[PDB]
């Protein structure tokens, strides 16, 4: 069971994870609960203003402090004690599978989604526990990053359901038909030999990591078998 | 003008970008067009089967080849000549702002969204031009990655509308009120001095990059002004 509070100007976006696929089933079955608060609903002016001008000028707008702060405090009260508050931002800790495993240890999170140029620095200081980025690129809002985080952590919730699992890229996979545009399925996978198949998959994962993302292998303490299969793949490449 | 074809089992997820915010306005105004095809609609069996068992066993399922291949070919025909076909996968090129700028050079892309354990390796060989990842973590499907890519590239389309822009994290931003939980807005930003403000923002970007993501600075050819402001920030830190 995991509870995620979300602060967003566009809560309907979250239907993309709550209504579809494995995450949607997690939500319908109560394995994951996602509750949203919208800063617009905390405004008091006639036109429900949710942006504000940055001090110092420059182009762009910021989220208005009062509606956003009020929304955050409502979510914190709903979460009760022990909920970590995360702000999605490219200035935050870059998400990776280790970071996903750490976040999945939380039974409650509140995810704050910015729009426009972002949010006031002092709200980060006073209301946010951690800032997290989904990658070194800039999106229009924090909603896709928050949904990405939700989706990645939800995979760890028992009952909801490997690249980076053991630190390696996944092996190639094949299904019917046996021959596709003259390309055949590797016969080892048709052999029925479980141990040969296991080794092939592991060797492929090693080879693909080495060729595509060699920096990922630096970080790893390979097993003796992995060292051997990696050496075999590298010799085949040099042949 | 940019055209994006999407192949997905859950095309309704894309409402999250087509109906909301800056990307939603881009779609309504015809700056961005997003067209979806669903492999389910290309099935012929009574129960519209879209998954299939992997050769070699192991847990999990793959996308079924025939419906997915047929959907891809329909999208390719709709795109006409010159559309790059991308498969979203953690085995692909990790997206970053340089990669976003390169993808934004395409007037047409087709984005293939996998589910389950993925897709047959031979379809990658025969139908996919490039594989791209949004980060080193595993999600339940390619839809959030495809939407992330769409959102990031859409920011480059003229008329739709900085971290990583010049390679640096953004500076902190402040809006009303002047004092928030006893934290005051930096007086330079209230000074009205454009050149002082510009320098402060740049120095803050340098400082924040250095402290949070020092590896990003390695990659940069700093200007003389940036070298100076970075040195000032580092001396203030050592004081
Ligand atoms: C246009 S961005 C704000 C851009 C601002 N100039 C900056 O670089 O931080 C709008 C919202 O999307 C969130 N956002 C953009 N890219 C993100 C990313 N890669 N990871 C997490 N959140 C992101 C931001 O933190 C911000 O609240
Ligand atoms: C459960 S993942 C497939 C996992 C498979 N064992 C692997 O590691 O490649 C399901 C779909 O989501 C896409 N996906 C998962 N994480 C992604 C990421 N970080 N970037 C892009 N696509 C991703 C996949 O390529 C796949 O088609």
Curated annotation (Swiss-Prot), chains A, B:
Binding site for S-adenosyl-L-methionine: 87, 114, 134-139
Catalytic activity: guanosine(37) in tRNA + S-adenosyl-L-methionine = N(1)-methylguanosine(37) in tRNA + S-adenosyl-L-homocysteine + H(+)
Molecular function GO labels: tRNA (guanine(37)-N1)-methyltransferase activity
Single biological process term from Gene Ontology: tRNA N1-guanine methylation
Residues at the catalytic site: 162 (proton acceptor)
One Pfam assignment: tRNA_m1G_MT
EC number in record: 2.1.1.228
Subunit structure: Homodimer.
Task performed by this protein: Specifically methylates guanosine-37 in various tRNAs.
PANTHER family the record matches: TRNA (GUANINE-N(1)-)-METHYLTRANSFERASE (PTHR46417:SF1)
The protein, known as: tRNA (guanine-N(1)-)-methyltransferase
Native organism: Haemophilus influenzae (strain ATCC 51907 / DSM 11121 / KW20 / Rd)
Gene name as annotated: trmD
